[PDB]
Design a protein around this nucleic acid. Sequence first.
RNA 1: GUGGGGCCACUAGGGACAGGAUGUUUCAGUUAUUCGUGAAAACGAAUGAAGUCACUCUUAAAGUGAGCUGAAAUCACUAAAAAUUAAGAUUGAACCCGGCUACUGACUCUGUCAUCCGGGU
DNA 2: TTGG
DNA 3: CCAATCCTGTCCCTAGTGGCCCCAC
Length: 1229
Amino acid sequence: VKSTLAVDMGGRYTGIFSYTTDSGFPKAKEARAYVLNMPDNDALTYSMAARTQTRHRIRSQQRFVLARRLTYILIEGKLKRKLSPREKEAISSLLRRRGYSRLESELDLSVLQGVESGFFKCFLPNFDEDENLLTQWTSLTDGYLQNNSDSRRQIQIFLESSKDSKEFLTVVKSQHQDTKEYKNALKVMRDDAESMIEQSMFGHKHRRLYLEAIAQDIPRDSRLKPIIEAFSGVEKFHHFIGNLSNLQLRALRWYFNDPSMKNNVFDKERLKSVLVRAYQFFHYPKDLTQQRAEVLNAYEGATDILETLQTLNPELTIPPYEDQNNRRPPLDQTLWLSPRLLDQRYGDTWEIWVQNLLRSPLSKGIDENLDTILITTDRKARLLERQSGRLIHYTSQKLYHSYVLQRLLDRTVENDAYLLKTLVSSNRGNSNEIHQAQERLTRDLGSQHIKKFLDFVRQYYDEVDKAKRGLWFIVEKPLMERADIHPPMKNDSVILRLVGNILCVSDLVDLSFWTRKVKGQSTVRSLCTAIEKTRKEYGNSFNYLYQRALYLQSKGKKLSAEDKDFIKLQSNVLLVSDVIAEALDIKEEQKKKFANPFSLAQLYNIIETEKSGFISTTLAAVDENAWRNNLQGKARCVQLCADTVRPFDGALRNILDRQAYEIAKLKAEELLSTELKNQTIDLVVLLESNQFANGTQAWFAKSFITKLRELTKEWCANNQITLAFDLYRLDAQTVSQDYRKKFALINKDWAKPDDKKQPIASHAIDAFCVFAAAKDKRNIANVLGVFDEVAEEQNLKTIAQLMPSEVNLISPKRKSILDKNEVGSRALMKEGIFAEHFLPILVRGDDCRIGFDWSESGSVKVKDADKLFGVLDGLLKQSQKRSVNGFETYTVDRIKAFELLHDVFIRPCSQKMLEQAEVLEKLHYITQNISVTSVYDAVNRQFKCREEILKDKDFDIKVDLGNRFGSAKGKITLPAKREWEKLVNRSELKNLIKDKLSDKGSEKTPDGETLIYDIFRSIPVQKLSHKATRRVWSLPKIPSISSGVRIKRKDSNGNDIYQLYMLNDTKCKGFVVNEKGVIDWSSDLVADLYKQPTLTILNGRYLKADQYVRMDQWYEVDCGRDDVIVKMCPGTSGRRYIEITQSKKQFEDWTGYISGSFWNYPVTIKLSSQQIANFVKNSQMPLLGKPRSGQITVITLGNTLKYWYCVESKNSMMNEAYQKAYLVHFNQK
RNA sequence: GUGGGGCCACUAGGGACAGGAUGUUUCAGUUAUUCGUGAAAACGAAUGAAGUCACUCUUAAAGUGAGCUGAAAUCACUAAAAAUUAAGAUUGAACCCGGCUACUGACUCUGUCAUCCGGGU
DNA sequence: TTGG
DNA sequence: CCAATCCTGTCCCTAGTGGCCCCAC
Ligand SMILES: [Mg+2]
Ligand SMILES: [Mg+2]
Ligand SMILES: [Mg+2]
Ligand SMILES: [Mg+2]
């Protein structure tokens, strides 16, 4: 029984062709074809960039919160009194906007005095040659600081123009000026301009600049006058604040990491221990030591820690760069002959065979360096045994025996007198060499257990051959063991043996050829540095140019410009090789191994640039491979095998992950359908022909195979299947060179459309061709059918009838928030908070209005207002009465209104409460600030019109109070519109913004955004040195809300803060169903994760649901025809989900959609408005409606299509038919 | 010409740690006074910062909106810390606690600390 | 880009 | 019709391009 599954593989679209042979060789119609969508990152997130950005945003917020908490704790501990809100506000103002921790180098502007300013007139036209460049640059920078508009525009022009320096370099070269000096000066002035822009317009500032700013601002702030009094001076308070603000998030995460600290208790010992924990976490730079020492001696030796924070300079405690070099070391992939598994398999006898083999004279010198190699742990199991302090499987003797065994089995053809891999192969011959090797064997090991040793040898060679193919995981019973322990990163002891190769040195204890100066101070290192510099400059063309130059020189041809340089490099490398041979005493052949520029360059890189990460394998593996290579002479034994590399390209890994299961599942569903009743074997075959533009294929195969075993272990163990696997990878172009073309010609149905991008079914066709191919290899896919190999026409005409009029599509999706138990792994609420207002009530007497002012546009008249006031009752708040002679204003109490809106949402409420909740939500409206730069179209590079900016959709509020709430019916204009008008009617803008769309022509203003900035860039006095910069100015509008949720949180003072967000995902989990089986389509059944005491869904009310129908529950509804079959599910609260299975001719007749048969169809079809209208008018069924935006998601293709879509809008007929189907199922139970 | 394996250079791709700035909303204050002198040209300064504009009333006393300034919040369950905006079938990652018996790293020259190892969430 |  | 936006230091990793030198099929 065969279970071949051919996979085309791809970035997104994955073609699969799978079958189960069952009845015999090849298969009947049982064959199946699938295509895998693997959607984009927005439909199924794989990249963690957004996730880690959110995590670091939360990390920064929590860092600030914990720093403020600790600062308040310490300040209250010193004061012996609680901080007033003003003191808290001042302290937090000090703690806000600390600079970045990067290292800043002072700019050397003096070099600007060494150049002529005229050559800079291309970037600085206003400059002249009559004055020094430094003076003009200082004046320009000072004007920029003083907000001089001319200086601002000059800086902007210089920054924009000096992006490319080629013209400036040509100009300076025209006067024979040094290009390097002028380039350095230009770089210096560019750096100065960029720093000025970053500090002034972004307002970043360094940490030291932040410390200086708070030092200047602490005396001026009077709210800190008591605090400074308790801290015995401004300097000590500044030191304390700067020291606290220098703490990282992890330092503040410690200390507070205690359940007893929810009451914010202050203890000096914990603070000192935490501060010692920090500044020991950092790896300070070597040049930055003696500053680490100062901080550590201050903190560790602190007898008061609070007085130490007050006395230590905050500039010393600025953290260094975070070097997470040991965050996750790679795992060594070396495969080691494991004495643990050797014990588990053969008892003691394997060491007995090793001992017997060692005694033979032919095994002399095979344990040459094992006394010095065994001291280094090589595998995870040996590491665990040594950690436990009890070596049982991995003693020194056992490790020696395993190493000797592995060396003997892996000996090269020259050194193998026993001729393994031939004396053991099942296809062995009967020559005299085999007989004499057998006689040489079993003379030491013994004929009593020769069979066991040969079985061991066969299994070992088979599994190392599988490892060499990158599929060592398939063996299901490993006798080798992966290292899975971290290697070191290239330290000096590692360095000595890394230079052992290349130079071919056996026991290099010290690099004497580099230190003892055989040829003076210029010994090797300078010449090798020059070689490396030249090779890096020439790049990847270095080898080609060097070879051409050497060939020309050997032929005696004329030398080119670079030929002399290459010959000089050849002489230099010859000299370096001579010096190395003199210092090491190596033979001619041993010397030639590194007589090329690449070897010397890599030696220099090793010695001088060693800090470049971890090495691949452990030192034991490196030493064993060095012994096996034996570069001093000929090689003995082959190098150690290794597994495929576990680390991958992150999200790409995830891709394959999902793909694997999304194929394995299908295979499971294919295998579960057939019993096969045979307890012997099933041969699952993998064929992969990924069209790369094994690496990723090996990991994909690993995941697919492991997940298939995990899926089918139950079905296998129930009735003894015990699946077997084999991997086959085909050539990149062979399947697409002739097989695909021949099949396209034979069938004439798909014809290999290409069309610059393969359609959805083309990948399935390619996977089918992969299955059909590989039969000619006779080694890969050897037994894929009978090896008859009939003529080309007959051979290829018996395979062209596949794809039995169906091509299934699998579209992975990100599960659902309803089916997810850890709902925190999903974005619940969208970013951005919306403002929640309530319309004021204006009362003159018997005349009442709802709105902002008594104008006919600013308010709506209310009749019978006593009903409104009676229903509102305690939810209204008087405006402190004030001058009642004018009028009375009643404003909705925000706290009571929000509490009541949560009460009516989270639990059943009385009729009065629901009534006043309805009134509150009728008075409710939502606004949000949008930037004034929205008046400018950043895509068309022109300003919008007044009708496109002041549209009534963004400023009108509908008042629709019913008869029992007065009769307040009308529309109000948001007063913020009058603030938008003032912006549009501004003098700087009244001409740029046109009046209407027709008036607005093709005129463009590329610098409109900077113009708007300069309009709104206000110039405050420098009263505070720690002020925040502003670069966004906005005005309110009425936004397009979507699933509003009001969240209750706590401020620093413990009050209730209500903030309105938009839900990012599904809100309704289903539709409630009564005892009679009737679905209530008009009720919102909010998912249970939103029913929290701190969450209030907008317009949501309590709804009891003992029985309901889920949004996923599909049913085949009572369609009016037998030609098509349609299924419905609720899907979403407002839009049903419709799945239609129908003849493809019916789909092409209903819709004006034309394509090159179903083979050319896409997975997602975008219907035009004409196609949507055709589909609606030709389906003759409002039961199915129309797709949302003409989007159709195809499930299966062929003569009978099967697709699904989300409707544009729900219908009564949709609900009626789904209710009929659900009632049928409910009554039938 | 074949792949496998150890070491170097090049771009990119991925994950993590530190974060920076600005937004959005909530709350509060501003709707403004005083000195340089008293002609006050007119701007500078002090009050921690902000002190402005528009609309609706009636005999200035305001209501409403915006702006400005300041802090606070900025997924929920969920709170001291952690996890929490990826997947979920399975996982990865993150963080905390313990240890130097030991794989790796920073110090150090012989003992600490970890991003390491073992647990837990 | 899909649930309001 | 709606979904906040940019930039910065470090470290380690995977995958192409060429080149070094061992072992082969
Ligand atoms: Mg604000
Ligand atoms: Mg804050
Ligand atoms: Mg170490
Ligand atoms: Mg620890």
